[PDB]
Amino acid sequence: GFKRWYPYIDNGGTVIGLTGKDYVILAADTRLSLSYSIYTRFCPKISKLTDKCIIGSSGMQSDIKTLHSLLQKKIQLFVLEHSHYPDIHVIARLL
Amino acid sequence: SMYDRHLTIFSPDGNLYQIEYAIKAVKNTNITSVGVKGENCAVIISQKKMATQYISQDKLLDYNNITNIYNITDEIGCSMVGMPGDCLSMVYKARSEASEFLYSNGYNVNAETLCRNICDKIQVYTQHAYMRLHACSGMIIGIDENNKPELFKFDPSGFCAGYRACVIGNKEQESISVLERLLEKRKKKIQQETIDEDIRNTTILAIEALQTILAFDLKASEIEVAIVSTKNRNFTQISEKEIDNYLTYIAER
Amino acid sequence: SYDRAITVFSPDGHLLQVEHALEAVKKGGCAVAIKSSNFAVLAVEKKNIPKLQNPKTTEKLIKLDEHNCLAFAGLNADARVLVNKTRLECQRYYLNMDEPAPVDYIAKYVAKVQQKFTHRGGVRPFGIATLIAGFKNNKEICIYQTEPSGIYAAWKAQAIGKNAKIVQEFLEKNYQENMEQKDCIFLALKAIFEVVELSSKNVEVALLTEKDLTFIEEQEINSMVELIDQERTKNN
Amino acid sequence: YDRGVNTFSPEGRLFQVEYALGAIKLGSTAVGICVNDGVILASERRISSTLIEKDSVEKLLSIDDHIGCAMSGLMADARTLIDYARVECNHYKFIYNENINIKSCVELISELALDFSNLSDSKRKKIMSRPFGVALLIGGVDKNGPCLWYTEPSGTNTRFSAASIGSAQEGAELLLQENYKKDMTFEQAEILALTVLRQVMEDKLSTSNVEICAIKKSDQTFYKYNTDDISRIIDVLPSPV
Amino acid sequence: RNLYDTDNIIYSPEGRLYQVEYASEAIKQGTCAVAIKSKDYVVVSGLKKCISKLSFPQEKIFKIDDYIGISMSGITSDAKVLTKFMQNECLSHKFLYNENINIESLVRSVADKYQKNTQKSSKRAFGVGLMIAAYHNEPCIFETRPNGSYFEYDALSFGARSHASKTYLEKNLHLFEECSLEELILHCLKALKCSLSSESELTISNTALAVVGKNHPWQEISSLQLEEYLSKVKMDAEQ
Amino acid sequence: ARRYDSRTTTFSPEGRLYQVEYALEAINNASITIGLITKDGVILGADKVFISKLIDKANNYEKIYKIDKHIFCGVAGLNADANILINQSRLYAQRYLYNYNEVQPVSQLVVQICDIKQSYTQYGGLRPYGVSFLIGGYDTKDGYQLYHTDPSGNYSGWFATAIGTNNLTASSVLKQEWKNDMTLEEGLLLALKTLAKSTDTEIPKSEKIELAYLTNKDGEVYQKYLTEKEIEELIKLYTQKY
Amino acid sequence: GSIYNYNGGCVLGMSGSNCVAIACDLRLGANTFTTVSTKFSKIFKMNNNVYVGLSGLATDIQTLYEILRYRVNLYEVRQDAEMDVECFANMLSSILYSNRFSPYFVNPIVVGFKLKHYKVNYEPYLTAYDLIGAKCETRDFVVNGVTSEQLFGMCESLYVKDQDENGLFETISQCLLSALDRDCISGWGAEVLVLTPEKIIKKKLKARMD
Amino acid sequence: MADGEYSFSLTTFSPTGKLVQIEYALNRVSSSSPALGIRAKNGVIIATEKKSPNELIEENSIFKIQQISEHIGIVYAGMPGDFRVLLKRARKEAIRYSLQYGSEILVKELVKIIASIVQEFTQTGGVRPFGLSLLICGVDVYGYHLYQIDPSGCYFNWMATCVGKDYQNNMSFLEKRYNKDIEIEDAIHTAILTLKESYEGVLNEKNIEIGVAYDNKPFKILTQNEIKDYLIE
């Protein structure tokens, strides 16, 4: 017979954050891997959400891309419906 | 009420005037079809004429495409007279009914049962107020499972019946008289016919009947003739050349 | 499923179906509810053919749940369906909160149902007005009155149904606060008989306390009716 | 009647919406005033009799901590709209962890009000079978400071610095137009509100026939006025001449 | 009596749909808007209706997407439903395909939304018109009607007494193609002023103005720049 | 299509429901149905409408119907509507038995069927049921019971009552003659008297009479639908007693 | 099968001359070895000519009995007659099959009289079922329940054709008791119903209680 | 359409309490070709007038007497399409009963189910009533039955009856010569004589259909030759 297909894969990579008094650093490596092979050496893990807010993710690349794009869509819709850009805290609750 | 002639509801005398008006709409098309049964065959003859409707007939119209005879299955065809949208709709309903029957039961529907199922469908239009009646009257022919021809006719009221011969069109009392005379004249012979002789006689009777009804000289290009027999159980039209030969024989007699 | 808008705005800006429901309510019997320190008296006209109709069957003063009762005027069948909906909601509230439903919550629910039936396709409004007596969560006694439009208010004393204006005006100039049970009962009887024939068999009276809903006995009503007849004859 | 609810008139106006507009001209009069320090809502209450409990009936409801509302027209419809606004404002608060902007609440209310038009099946299906026949004044304080908004059965929302609704709408609006000023401080806003209400109220102004609420910019918290506050405003009022 | 204007699915003996035509009539009652375009820019200008002295002017133009904006005339709630639909279609297209939607396809979808509301007795036509201005490989202006038709324009105007603005636009249509953004704005504002009531004037309060072009995302004009433009318009009107 | 809607569930300018008034007119135009409670059981009697001598008059009761073992009804109004609602009420009684493992109290059954009728008056766009029911039964909670329902979903309990045509005369006869403790025989004779007086005659006719009663004897409830012979015997007794 | 061992129990039907008998054990088991009741009858009267014996899972016994009572009562009120035993048997088969894939865990028997109106002749009628409604019409005896093998042996060995009511009672009671004495999860009393067209005799046997 | 706001009753009460649509369906029936049934001692007969419009139609294609199951037959007076629909429904209900209970559907049960179906069409939204009356005859354990079903959904139990045109005079003629103790042959002769007294002119084996259920036998439709034999006398 055929085994049930597993819908998860870890594409690897790290995201690192560090706050300051008036700044925040978010860094991420760009490798995209599959098991012990490299799909590509350049797959950015950080997406810009607002002028003052970005998001960085690690895990399954298809999920990360869909989630970043969904969050960007929701935020643009929020901007159109409510006339202002959501603060980082609003986005945190929404995520 | 004031709307008893608008919906399919009874009027004070018990009539459903919408059914009568749909039948009149069929009559208004000015199209005449005739079906005739033989001993081992059946024929339908119709005018290759556009139904009198809002638009008229252009000289750029492709007259070969004008028809009122359709195949339901390989072995079952029909004439559909009435509003062309309704006639096409009834053709598709009949085709789907036949196909569903075949799949469900593993054998082809015969003409009688297909007519009765179609009329079951039409009755729903006659009882539900929100649906318009299909202004369409039809004739269905086929060869049943005992190698006998069938001739059945339905009309907008959902009433169907088998016939020795039938006419759809404007006049139908005088058409019935003409057909009765032709049938008794054919019956009074006692010689036994061959299959081919039977088919020839049936087709000639159908053509002569349509001609005596319409009261003018039929041109082979303006009429269509379809046959089913025990020699060839497929519902097939005949060529314009064979129709012309039948017409030349009829005229010279 | 039928979906036509039955209640619509007339050119004047009125919901004529709601006003016709109000007419139905005005064709009902009179009901009076009076409030006190920790009890309420509810009374309602009785109509019953003598010796043939059974009086114990028809119920215009009914118990929703442990602590809430209801009187109504207007169409009986509408009232029965609305009352069963209200009992169901009482129990649903108890299940979802682990506490019995307060009186104000139930009044708001009843008014919401009536409003909703003025604002949904394919339904007509309830032809009933209701008086709801019960306890709030602070154990305070309250009386609410709802109407077919869905509007409600709390009252110290109120009458609904046919001839409700006469009863209302009477109650205005005769109602005191923190009256004793017997005096509140007597006031309710006087209010109801302001517009209904004087008789014991023409009125049903109940008293609402924290404990339960208790209907006043026949003999007590007859004695109070004799008192009313005496005061009437002596006043004439 | 003969028509359907979605019919246009020959001048391109929905008959039902126009009729609903004639229902909002009824009821107690309310006035909203929005100045820099906050927004004030004041309404007259039309007590039908001494037997009615004043606490029960109220024309100034709070939609959220930072939003209040005055209403006119059909009170059952108004309560339906207000309950919907409360649910929606709290859902916004849950999914965004912040107070909803007043204008967004007004938009939600207006869409609910117009739902009878059956214009689109997106999200919930049509349930309301007619307009609401309610006009509202919705004031509150959001990140943009105090603001006063007006919504009516046609679904148009308009922002005001001061406005009025109810039976005495026109007289109150005349008084507001000629007296309102932008740099007005809060106490002067209260004085103006009660002066207008007293001038247009059939009864004589007093602590029991007038209700007040304010949403000050200092704390963005809807606050109801008890008897002491109304007493102070009344006793600081001008002469009735 | 008409006997044919009661329901939206009924043709009159002349082949007309009266309910849809009434929905269109609603459009002529709105405030005036003007859209004109050069080879690189589309300028949209409209009048903001004021209810009373103490009221804030109503909003006339709306952003749909980075390079798409609309103006409307007619029933505001209808326009809001359509605005939400367009914003969602654009954002969903960006989400799915990572590109800015084709403006023709969006306008066709809007017109089909219009059309579906005219075929059933349980619906009514949207009682609003949409003027759509975008830059997608070129400036473009579209109009959508309650009957489900849409048209592309080089200059467009509708609303109450928009025939004066249309006269102005027809007169100067030849100029708009080659004129600079400043000149295009002046032309749009003058066309809008041509629809003004006698006593009225164009002010920062009651005038909505947006630009969108090749490298210029949809953007409303600020009060200071708008005021300078209005002053220039008045000065060259005095001439 | 709204032009064809008759608006059945719409209030009238006086808070009336016209379809319900007309259904009540139809019920008033139906043959008399009477009922009364003795100490021995509930009696239901009815006048049969003549159609032809060729109707099959054997075991053919058309106005009194068994709903359950302890419940049975009399009908006044449209017989087909009544057949629908009788089927429904039989279902309701059996459903109560299924859910609770005990027979349904009579008032609960009456309430369920009356809810059906009220719902037709309030929801939808259909005409109401044109039937009045005289529902009688026995249960341990309330003893012998008798109820009257109308198209509006209304009902009420009675010690004796009549519905259908000329219910005024029958009701007056019952009010004069009905007593608080009657025996089954006295009840049946009184039922025959009121049936005869409402049909404008003096000696009733067996062919035109349906009589049934419902007794709780020795702990079980039993229903007797009197035949033409038993009714003939009772008619003889009535003509003796009057 | 373990589900059927949860409660235990069995039922037995037998016919004589113008008589028929139905018998069951009285135990309600739990967890296959704990006796929680000794008056749990598996025999149910549908009407005077139709009885059903329901062995198996007690919850399913009660549920199916309630369904059957509902159906019989509706049929008989609509028709104004007593349901014929064969119609009832076919109906029970159809009800069991309607749950073909999530069945009631029951092992029914039907015992009664088939009436053949000329006077009236009363022909004994017996049928045994499986849980999905397969039917076995028989003239001598029917069995069902976890004790089926023992009952089959006892009946095959002891059944005697055309016995009178007393002989029928003795035979069916002996068959039931001997079968029960070999079952760990059945017994604790036996009820025996002997049917004739005129009377029903209900007996409780002095049986083993271990 | 069917559902939605467009589902409202087309049959409604008039001020006098009458449901006029049912009356109009009744008129439609009273204008239809006569039918009748007779309950005899050991059988029940249903007979109908089947008058061929023209010599072209095939009589066998028109059968106004149909079998619902073994032992149950049906004839109608009124609209034939309605009859076809109701006959299909009756056959379906007969087999549904047979699947549940194994045996054949009792005549009363079938009649009640079909009457309820007919009644639905006088109350449900968006439809007209059926324009016909049905006579249902059959034999079961409980004897022989002859039932009529009216457009309203009321059903009657008959010893003998006639529906369709001239049915008052036909019923007078039939009650003049019906007794409970007739035989099958006498009943068939009486049915033929009634249909002759109604029909104008001369009847024959083509102008009428006859169906019998007698001596606990399956329902059968008399052939042309059998009826001709009945017509010889």
Added chain:
Amino acid sequence: SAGYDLSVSTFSPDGRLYQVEYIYKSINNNNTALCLECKDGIICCCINSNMDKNKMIKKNSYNRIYHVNNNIIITYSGFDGDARNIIDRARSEANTYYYNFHTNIPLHILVNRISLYIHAYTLYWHMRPFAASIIISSFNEKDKGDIYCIEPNGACYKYSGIVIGKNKEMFKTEIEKKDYKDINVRDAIEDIYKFILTSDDHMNKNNLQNLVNFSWICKESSYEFQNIHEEILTPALNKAVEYIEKL
């Protein structure tokens, strides 16, 4: 009329459906569309003369000629929204046919399906019937041209050349003079421009450029849909115009 013309589902006592006739009147009042079979292709032309006073419309932006599979021309006269609806349905049927069978939907089957779709909106009392007539046509080497015209009543007929919409009678009178089965599409262009000049009095040689849509399926276009280039329409327009101004 007489109350029988308020619904598409009520026959009049004379057997006519009046809502359908009113739709026909609407279509006959609308702009003109024609399709013509030539020797080596079919040629379609839409004359948008109703828009002659719409001076600000973007030049050549309103086109009523669409295509299905890049080899079937579909055009209309009547409401634009209804026509777009029907064209969407035509394309949806083509997609479904391809999905089921992996070959393009034959023209006549597609015509039947479209006509049935249209006819279904004439059957119920709550749906507005489509106010548009449709021309659907194709052309290939072995079969020559196929032109079908679908009516609002749902009747589809086959033509060698068809004119729908306003002034169709005069256009037909002009078309019928010559047998175009022996003329090439390029040569037919000038004839069509001449017919437009003569028959539509709203059309002059000034607005002929921006008011006429031209498309064809011919040998030159490899028997696939194509809008006729302006470099072909220009000489033909000029020649028709000078010829007309001569007489």
